[PDB]
Amino acid sequence: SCSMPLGMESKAISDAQITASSYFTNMFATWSPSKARLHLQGRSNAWRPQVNNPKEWLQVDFQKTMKVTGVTTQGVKSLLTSMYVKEFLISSSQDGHQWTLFFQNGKVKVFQGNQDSFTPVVNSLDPPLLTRYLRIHPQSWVHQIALRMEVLGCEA
Ligand SMILES: N=c1n(CCN2CCCCC2)c2ccccc2n1C[C@@H](O)COc1ccc(Cl)cc1Cl
């Protein structure tokens, strides 16, 4: 009863609500944070950071506190090149300034993500996370960091 998609795919979460540490842009594509939407199609259809390393993150602002019970991630196939995140951390905030890493079994939870570019993987957050902001912190990846996502939950 609390696993509704919050709006990444449907665009109920608007472009302005999605930001990142950095993003990659060249003459070919602009891999903006707001392209990080599950199942999005087109030439620029994922978020990619400017550089590949664990200091990078993607942020969503729900603009009120929500109950988050899951996140869904996907990579992207760009031309003939597979790109996906294999492992990631989550952090959260109510005020946008002070952040908290999601813990499980006594340590920061390392979420196991994707195994290809195109198939979604759902990761449950237990206990549920009550938060206004959510950040995803890629830790490992195949070839390049690329993300399309969804957030699952309900009202706080
Ligand atoms: N997790 C990664 N990291 C950093 C995250 N890690 C924790 C710190 C040490 C390295 C793993 C990578 C850095 C550069 C390149 C790949 C990285 N990965 C994913 C790598 O762990 C494995 O991914 C690959 C598999 C096949 C090919 Cl052809 C290419 C790649 Cl990249």
CATH number for the domain spanning 99: value is 2.60.120.260
The three-state DSSP-derived secondary structure of 18-40 is EEECCCCECCCCECCHHHCECCC
Q: Which residue is closest in CA terms to ligand 1's atom 24?
A: 142
**Pairing mode, if any, of strands 111-112 and 81-93?**
antiparallel
Q: Rounded distance, CA 120 to CA 9, Å?
A: 12
Give DSSP secondary structure letters for 97-127: SS-EEPEETTEE--EE--SSSSS-EEEEEEE
Please give the distance of CA 99 from its chain centroid, rounded to a whole number.
16
| Nearest alpha carbon to residue 119 among 79, 153, 72 | 72
Q: Atom 11 in ligand 1: which residue has the minimum CA distance?
A: 140
Selection from 144, 22, 23, 8 nearest residue 85 by Cα: 144
For ligand 1, which residues put their CB under 6 angstroms from it? 54, 139-143
Pocket mutation for ligand 1, best pick of 48, 111, 142, 145 (most atoms within 8 Å of C-beta):
142
- Number of C-beta neighbours around residue 127 at 10 A: 8
Distance CA 18, CA 60 (A): 5
Ligand 1 pocket test: which of 83, 140, 144, 145 has the largest number of ligand atoms within 8 Å of its C-beta?
Answer: 140
Token pair 């031309």 in the structure block, residue: 79
Contact 102, 108 (CB under 8 A): yes
**What approach was used to elucidate this structure?**
X-ray
- Amino acid (1-letter code) at residue 86: K
Contact 146, 48 (CB under 8 A): yes
CA–centroid distance for 118 within its chain: 15
**Ordered DSSP codes for 31-81:** --GGG-BTT--SSS-SB--SS-STT--EEEEEEEEEEEEEEEEE-EEETTE
Name the phi and psi angles at 17, rounded to 5. -80, -5
Instruction: Give the β-pairing of 107-108 and 111-112.
Output: unpaired
Amino acid at 41: Q
Domain ranges, residue 12: 1-156
Token pair for residue 155? Answer: 């009202």
Which of 50, 42, 46 minimizes the C-alpha distance to 24?
Answer: 50
Length of the chain: 156
- Cα–ligand 1 centroid distance for 82 (angstroms): 13
Q: What is the DSSP letter of 102?
A: P
**Residue 146: is it exposed, middle or buried by C-beta count within 10 angstroms (0-12/13-18/19+)?**
buried
Coil/strand/helix, residue 147: strand
Q: How many domains does the chain have?
A: 1
